[PDB]
C-alpha cells in the first residue's frame, strides 16, 4: 500500500483565508507594508532633507507589518499541516 508515504503538502501557501481573522490580519498588515514602504522611500529618496526620526518611525511600522505577514503565513502553514495530519490519519484505513 502506501507504506511510508504521507499526504503531499500543497504547492504554495494558499489556504484557510476563510478564517476571516487571518484575512483581516493579511489585509491590514499588507496595506501597512505598502504604507511604510512608500513612506520610507519618500523620506529617504524623494526629500531634499532626510529626517531620520521620520525614518525610524516608519522603519518600526514597516518591520511590524512585515513580521505580521510572516506570522500569518506561518499560522497558515501550521493549519495546513494540522489538516494533513487528519488526512494522513484517515488514509490509514486504506491499508
Amino acid at each position: 500500500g502506501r507504506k511510508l508515504e504521507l499526504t503531499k503538502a500543497e504547492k504554495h501557501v494558499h489556504a484557510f483565508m476563510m478564517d476571516t481573522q487571518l484575512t483581516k490580519r493579511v489585509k491590514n498588515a499588507a496595506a501597512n507594508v505598502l504604507r511604510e514602504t512608500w513612506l520610507i522611500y519618500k523620506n529617504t529618496k524623494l526629500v531634499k532633507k532626510i529626517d531620520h526620526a521620520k525614518v525610524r518611525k516608519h522603519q518600526r511600522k514597516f518591520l511590524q507589518a512585515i513580521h505580521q505577514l510572516r506570522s500569518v503565513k506561518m499560522e497558515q502553514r501550521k493549519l495546513n499541516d494540522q489538516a494533513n495530519t487528519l488526512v494522513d490519519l484517515a488514509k490509514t484505513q486504506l491499508e
Binding site: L4, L6, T7, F16, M18, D19, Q82, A83, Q93
Partner: protein, 146 residues
C-alpha cells in the same frame, strides 16, 4: 478527485476515528481529543478553522459527506525519505552521517515508545549494511523507502 467505491467504504471506517461518540458529526471538541492523541496541541481557533474549512453548510460540525468531499481533494501522497533521514540525524552526534550500533540501541531502548532488545537486534541486522557496527542512516533509509 475520484474516489473508488473501495476508498469510499474504508473512509467510512475512517470517519469513526474522528466521530468519537458516533453521532454522525465531528465537532471541534472531538478533533481536539483526536489531535491531542496524536501528540499535537491545536488551539480552539485552530480547531474551529479545521471544522470550518470542511463544513459545507455552516452548522458547525463535519458530517461524512463533507468529510469525504475533503478527502477526495487530498489523496495525493509523497515519499518521506528525507523527513525520515532527518529524524535519524537527530541522533547523529558528530554529524558525520553515522550512528553506531551501540548508540542506536541506546536510543531505541530509552527514547520514545521504545523497542525490545530483541527488536533492536533485528533492526540493526538490517541497518548495519556493512557489518562494521556503524549505521549509515542515509543508506538505511534509502533501503527502507526503496
Amino acid at each position: 478527485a475520484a474516489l473508488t467505491e473501495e476508498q469510499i467504504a474504508e473512509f467510512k471506517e475512517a470517519f469513526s476515528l474522528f466521530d468519537k461518540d458516533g453521532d454522525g458529526t465531528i465537532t471541534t471538541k472531538e478533533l481536539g481529543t483526536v489531535m491531542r492523541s496524536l501528540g499535537q496541541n491545536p488551539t480552539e481557533a485552530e480547531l474551529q478553522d479545521m471544522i470550518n474549512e470542511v463544513d459545507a453548510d455552516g452548522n458547525g460540525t463535519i458530517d461524512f459527506p463533507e468529510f469525504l468531499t475533503m478527502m477526495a481533494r487530498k489523496m495525493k501522497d509523497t515519499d518521506s525519505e528525507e523527513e525520515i533521514r532527518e529524524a535519524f540525524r537527530v541522533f547523529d552526534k558528530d554529524g558525520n552521517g553515522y550512528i553506531s550500533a551501540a548508540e542506536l540501541r541506546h536510543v531505541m531502548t530509552n527514547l520514545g515508545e521504545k523497542l525490545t532488545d530483541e527488536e533492536v537486534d533485528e533492526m540493526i541486522r538490517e541497518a548495519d549494511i556493512d557489518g562494521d557496527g556503524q549505521v549509515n542512516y542515509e543508506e538505511f533509509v534509502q533501503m527502507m523507502t526503496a
